[PDB]
């Protein structure tokens, strides 16, 4: 996988507090580039990356039109879902959608995606064939039947093989300075005594892009998988990410431990010691 484009929609009902909220975000790789929020004073598809700003008003109007229409449709989907699960109109529920395309270094489609969740649980997904569906439950089977009847998969396929890949390629070119630049992690090991007998070694990775990274501690060359505390990769707020991995070690055994760092921005994996 060289690059991806993904759109994420969340539709959230809130009975008694107006119509369900609809929020959409678009990403290329780990870079957000657009958003829409139906609760905004003036809802529009709005830029979130500099390289998208150059798109003309027909782009922005068209995306806004789409997001408004999408909000209406997902409000209706929330109503339908209530019926499919025999649920009360008094509770709050959420539909999420993810879709997009992955392309190789040559820009050809590697694979397409279109998945839905209801209340945080898988609902229905387009299969890798971009032709058939996997329904999670008997409610989603009803949708599957309707979508098989309407040849919905063919529509997604046409988008995923066509416009998705074409627009992704455009974005990758317009944003080439950043979207096509890996920033390797800045790495170091810190040492924190806990007692006379043990200390924590923490291996840091900072300022990296994209988010994908592997940090592993070895003791005498053996992966310490079960004994390593690994925090979730976290955004720094400047486009880059941070992560650490820690192990508790016997005092005076520090040199038996090595931190190993793999990242796409590194020509070779790194080995660090305290």
């Amino acid at each position: 996988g060289s690059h991806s484009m993904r759109y994420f929609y969340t539709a959230m009902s809130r009975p008694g507090r107006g119509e369900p909220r609809f929020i959409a975000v678009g990403y290329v790789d780990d870079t957000q580039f657009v958003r829409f929020d139906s609760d905004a004073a003036s809802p529009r598809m709005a830029p979130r990356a500099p390289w998208i700003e150059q798109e003309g008003p027909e782009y922005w109007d068209g995306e806004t039109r789409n997001m408004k229409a999408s909000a209406q449709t997902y409000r209706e989907n929330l109503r339908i879902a209530l019926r499919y699960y025999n649920q009360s109109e008094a509770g709050s529920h959420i539909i999420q959608v993810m879709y997009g395309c992955d392309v190789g270094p040559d820009g050809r489609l590697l694979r397409g995606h279109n998945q839905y969740a209801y209340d945080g649980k898988d609902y229905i997904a387009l299969n890798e064939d971009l032709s058939s569906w996997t329904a999670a439950d008997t409610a989603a089977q009803i949708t599957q039947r309707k979508w098989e009847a309407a040849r919905v998969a063919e529509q997604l396929r046409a988008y995923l093989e066509g416009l998705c890949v074409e627009w992704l390629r455009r974005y990758l070119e317009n944003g080439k300075e950043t979207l096509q630049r890996a920033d390797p992690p800045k790495t170091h090991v810190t040492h924190h005594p806990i007692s006379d007998h043990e200390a924590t070694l923490r291996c840091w990775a900072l300022g990296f892009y994209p988010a994908e990274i592997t940090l592993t501690w070895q003791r005498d060359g053996e992966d310490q998988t079960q004994d390593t505390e690994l925090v979730e990769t976290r955004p720094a707020g400047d486009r880059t990410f941070q992560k650490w991995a820690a192990v508790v070690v016997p005092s005076g055994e520090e040199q038996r431990y090595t931190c190993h760092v793999q990242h796409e921005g590194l020509p070779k994996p790194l080995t660090l010691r305290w």
Binding site: G62, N66, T73, W147, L163
Partner: peptide, 11 residues
Amino acid sequence: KAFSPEVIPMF
């Protein structure tokens, strides 16, 4: 650019 079907699929 977002997916924009003539008819947006309903559940």
